Design an enzyme around this catalytic site. Structure first.
Site, PDB file in Angstrom:
ATOM      1  N   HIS A  58     -25.143  53.045 -25.152  1.00 17.14           N
ATOM      2  CA  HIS A  58     -26.524  52.635 -25.394  1.00 17.14           C
ATOM      3  C   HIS A  58     -26.898  52.759 -26.876  1.00 17.14           C
ATOM      4  CE1 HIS A  58     -28.301  51.540 -21.624  1.00 17.14           C
ATOM      5  NE2 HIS A  58     -28.192  52.729 -21.054  1.00 17.14           N
ATOM      6  N   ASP A  83     -38.639  43.287 -25.566  1.00 15.68           N
ATOM      7  CA  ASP A  83     -38.172  44.494 -26.220  1.00 15.68           C
ATOM      8  C   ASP A  83     -38.914  44.631 -27.561  1.00 15.68           C
ATOM      9  OD1 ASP A  83     -36.218  46.673 -27.129  1.00 15.68           O
ATOM     10  OD2 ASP A  83     -35.161  46.067 -25.334  1.00 15.68           O
ATOM     11  N   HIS A 141     -38.807  45.643 -21.052  1.00 14.09           N
ATOM     12  CA  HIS A 141     -37.791  46.606 -21.415  1.00 14.09           C
ATOM     13  C   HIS A 141     -38.093  47.332 -22.746  1.00 14.09           C
ATOM     14  CE1 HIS A 141     -33.450  47.689 -22.388  1.00 14.09           C
ATOM     15  NE2 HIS A 141     -33.639  48.164 -21.162  1.00 14.09           N
ATOM     16  N   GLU A 183     -26.522  57.510 -27.074  1.00 12.75           N
ATOM     17  CA  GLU A 183     -27.777  56.975 -27.590  1.00 12.75           C
ATOM     18  C   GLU A 183     -27.895  57.135 -29.091  1.00 12.75           C
ATOM     19  OE1 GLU A 183     -29.913  55.637 -25.411  1.00 12.75           O
ATOM     20  OE2 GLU A 183     -29.594  56.610 -23.473  1.00 12.75           O
TER      21      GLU A 183
END
Lengths: 448, 447
Positions: free
Chosen positions: A132, A163, A354, A382
């Site tokens: 991610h 987004d 999202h 992340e």
């Protein structure tokens, strides 16, 4: 004192100076598509992309076509695309994305003919962790977004998936991101090209995956050359996290929430906070700080199935999240009523939501691909750009992006404005009851 | 090369000599209960217990009463019961911890000791539990996979079938108490369960993570008089937690690889981690004999007779059966030749919980390891590896194995296990959905 520990940790972050002119918040997914294209066409030295996936659909093809075109014009262009290893090699729910990358490479047959697509496995099974990490680097420009490459994220036709998108023109930030990729992400004992026919099988490389995850979790970090602590100017700090212990990104988020003086704004796709973040929200609300949470309506979740269509199990997920939100709004009913807590629901026809983000007062703005869920706290890899804006140099641009975001939202006035379980489709009702009885819903929250 | 390294690794293990008269195989769960009582009543110095859980029920209460009696009568007795932290604080499917606290208050001992301690192997139970086994009563170790509840102790008509070995050897006893003191009982992360004011796991998250990492990396048993490659019946205590550097799991892997003639496995659910699947495949492809002994669907405690209302947890036994079915079809030729023997255990509504690895007539592993993906990455496990190079224990091993085999039937052919479409309708629906979205794969990995 955890709160004082948090101030100390934030103060100790290194930060790289950033002019306000060097940052743009893009408005929409159509702009994002346009920027990707313009940035690819102008690239002269390198193109690095880390995304969850890059889909074989029409948008995927248009973008990959742009790459091959510049690459055929510039044979020494350093192009590296890192996507999740498991995600690239399965279908949804005939050809996989990996099959398509090979097809394209064979069909274009560049004279150079290098590998450009690489699969990164964050764990031995997709469910226990995916890539991610976000960021596209074109020469000295960073385009940061939670978005992957497919039709909806780029608004190829009528539908889009919303987004956030930030363009930062900053050589030293760009160099730092590419260095992380080369130094930490691209370890070839575990990372394999997906655009060749001979790819190893997972079972074939389990041990390597394990050692890679362990090494990346303990050592991956970004480096800065001209970073200072507590600068007096708009600034950026790049952050990485993987796994539950010694996770810098998560430590920073937890500390951001503890260090709210006035107002916290949060964007998350699904209402599904880690318990640690739920507790920190409760403290903020008990201590008079304001909190704004923006999530998608049920219908803006991509697992949503219109009730006229045939029901599948995953179509219960948006209802699970909504009912968790309803419970939260009931717990914080007094705060909803006084406007201390603002809950906004995003909805725009059948388009999906999202967005991820954290804003602290007028002082910090975290750009992250982090979904703010238990998966992110334990399983997934992340990253983040923490923007520090001590003199409010970015305040006007932050508010413009936030007002665009709020356009398709409504402020929930009372938890009873959200649907109760009896108003849910009958198969969803059955499912949620079944799961709740044996607490399998708790499992769903922790792993999905 | 992995085979080669396997032999080397096994030969490097430190072993403590045992005499055949120092080991007893207990024949049943009633006998386990009887021995627990006798060992408690006769303890003069210490009682150490590590278990998954200790249920508030007739059996739990009765054993607890025994502990309280001997402690009231022998005030200096060192008593430590370690159970899983999360499991003690929830219900089946208010809690056990509240009942320990209540019992402590009721029995009102003068020095008011803590006796029950909760071990957090991870911040969420889903991500790791205390599967470390062993009771120590003075210099006697009682080793079993059994927890303390009604069925494990055969309190009424129903039993849950386990294995139970009694070893009297002060050095082994010491090794296990020392491990408990040195590695398990870190009071930074481990908390008495029998108090009024337990920390929420929220407050101790950082401690648990540090504790887990430290134990994964450093936990091990020590022996004083150990040698490599002894010429006598002997034992080696083993620990593991986590995917990397797990000594118990490396020993299990190596045992599989070093089979010369025959391998016998008991597992309570047919759900091998991939590494062991591959190794079994390798033995079968190489002419080694394998016997695997599992429960029938009916001997699984999530089973719900097709007559009663179905609940979704009732689909689990079927998932384990189809797993086995697929395996028996894959190794169809090996079943046909008799090289692979699959036994199914069933005794009315009694349930099956046996664990074991026996390699040739040389190695007997006693372990609470379920031989599943959970035990390979999530849970804290231990084991006692018996090495019997001169077959001094073989008579007792064969007697136990004969008893174990008594309520089994040899599977004749994979089709002896029902196919999906012959399952009850509600079961079929569930498994069909789960398969589509790969939920069945998820269940195998975490349950």
């Amino acid at each position: 004192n955890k709160t004082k520990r948090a101030e100390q940790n934030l103060n100790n972050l290194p930060f790289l100076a950033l002019q306000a002119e060097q940052i743009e918040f893009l408005g929409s997914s159509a702009e994002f598509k346009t920027q990707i294209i313009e940035l690819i066409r102008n690239a002269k030295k390198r193109i690095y992309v880390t995304a969850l996936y890059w889909q074989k659909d029409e948008a995927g093809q248009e973008i990959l076509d742009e790459i091959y075109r510049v690459k055929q014009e510039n044979p020494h262009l350093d192009v590296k695309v890192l996507i999740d290893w498991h995600r690239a090699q399965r279908n949804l729910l005939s050809a996989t994305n990996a099959d398509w990358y090979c097809e394209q490479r064979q069909t274009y047959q560049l004279p150079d003919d290098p590998n450009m697509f690489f699969g990164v496995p964050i764990n031995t099974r997709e469910v226990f962790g995916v890539l991610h990490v976000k960021g596209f680097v074109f020469d000295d420009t960073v385009l940061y977004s939670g978005a992957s490459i497919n039709n909806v994220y780029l608004h190829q036709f009528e539908k889009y998936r919303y987004d956030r998108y930030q363009k930062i023109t900053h050589a030293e930030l760009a160099d730092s991101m590419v260095n992380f990729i080369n130094d930490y992400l691209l370890d070839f004992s575990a990372v394999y090209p997906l655009d060749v026919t001979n790819r190893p099988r997972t079972k074939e490389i389990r041990g390597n995956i394990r050692a890679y995850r362990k090494d990346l979790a303990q050592n991956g970090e970004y480096s800065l050359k001209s970073a200072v602590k507590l600068p007096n100017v708009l600034s950026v700090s790049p952050l990485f996290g993987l796994g539950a212990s010694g996770n810098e990104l998560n430590q920073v988020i937890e500390d951001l929430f503890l260090q709210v003086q006035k107002k916290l704004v949060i964007c998350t796709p699904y209402f599904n906070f880690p318990r640690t973040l739920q507790h920190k929200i409760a403290t903020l609300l008990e201590n008079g700080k304001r909190v704004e949470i923006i999530v998608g309506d049920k219908v803006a979740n991509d697992f949503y199935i219109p009730p006229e269509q045939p029901f599948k199990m995953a179509g219960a997920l948006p209802y699970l999240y909504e009912s968790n939100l309803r419970r939260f709004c009931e717990k914080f009913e007094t705060q909803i009523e006084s406007g201390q807590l603002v809950v906004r629901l995003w909805r725009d026809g059948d388009n999906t939501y999202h967005l991820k983000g954290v804003w602290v007062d007028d002082r910090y703005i975290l750009l992250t691909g982090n979904n703010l869920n238990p998966r992110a706290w334990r399983l997934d890899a992340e990253n983040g750009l923490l923007i520090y804006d001590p003199q409010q140099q970015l305040l006007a641009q932050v508010e413009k992006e936030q007002n665009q975001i709020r356009q398709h939202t409504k402020v929930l006035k009372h938890y009873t404005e959200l649907e109760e379980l009896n108003q849910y489709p009958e198969p969803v009702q059955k499912l949620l009851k079944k799961f709740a009885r044996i607490k399998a819903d708790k499992l769903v929250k922790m792993i999905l």
